[PDB]
């Protein structure tokens, strides 16, 4: 039980960090094209899917 719980917590942490890292990296890659272009349409849907 000790080994099982420790393995689950380690798996959860590694998975949550990877998930958040991938999602945050997605936002940076999705939004960066528009930060370098202040005069852009920036559709509202962009702020809903990539944020």
């Amino acid at each position: 039980t000790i080994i099982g719980l420790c393995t689950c917590v380690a798996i959860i942490m590694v998975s949550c960090v990877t998930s958040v890292w991938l999602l945050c990296r997605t936002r940076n890659l999705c939004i960066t094209p528009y930060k370098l272009a202040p005069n852009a349409q920036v559709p509202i849907l962009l702020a809903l899917l990539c944020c």
Binding site: L29, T32, P33, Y34, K35, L36, A37, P38, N39, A40, Q41
Partner: protein
């Protein structure tokens, strides 16, 4: 001044530009910006465009370059002379541009910046420029013709 040289060991290793309140410099160019006001800005990385960006001091915001995406075919101006825009590609005569010229801006006849020169292709009689520009929707895009090398 609109263009600021970047010095590594006392030699110029590139140029930094300020457009619409934001400063851009080549990500692959190492060294300090030869400007006390710009050297104090902490810039964010944008690996998609091989450049770093950030905001400029309130004193400079009033005189930054104007962004534009209207890029009809024809000739454009840049630091070393004129630039030809054809087939959605920026090209210049052979011998115009080289190592250390990365980050220079390309402007239209209205003084608006259309692309940032990061590199190019050395051909037999002409050269093709690897630049960062904007599409018809105004979204930043990087154009890197096959064989482009950073300058």
């Amino acid at each position: 001044d609109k263009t600021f040289p970047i010095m590594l060991n006392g030699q110029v290793n590139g140029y930094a530009c300020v457009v619409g309140g934001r400063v851009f410099k080549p990500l692959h160019v190492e060294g300090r910006i030869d400007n006390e006001q710009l050297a104090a800005i902490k810039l964010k990385k944008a690996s998609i465009y091989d450049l770093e960006y950030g905001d400029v001091p309130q004193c400079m915001k009033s005189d930054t370059l104007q962004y534009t995406s209207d890029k009809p075919p024809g000739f454009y101006n840049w630091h070393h002379g004129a630039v030809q825009y054809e087939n959605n590609r920026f090209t210049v005569p052979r011998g115009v541009g080289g190592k250390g010229d990365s980050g220079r801006p390309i402007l239209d006849n209205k003084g608006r910046v259309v692309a940032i020169v990061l590199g190019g292709v050395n051909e037999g009689s002409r050269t093709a420029l690897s630049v960062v520009t904007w599409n018809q929707k105004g979204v930043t895009v990087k154009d890197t013709p096959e064989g482009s090398e950073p300058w």
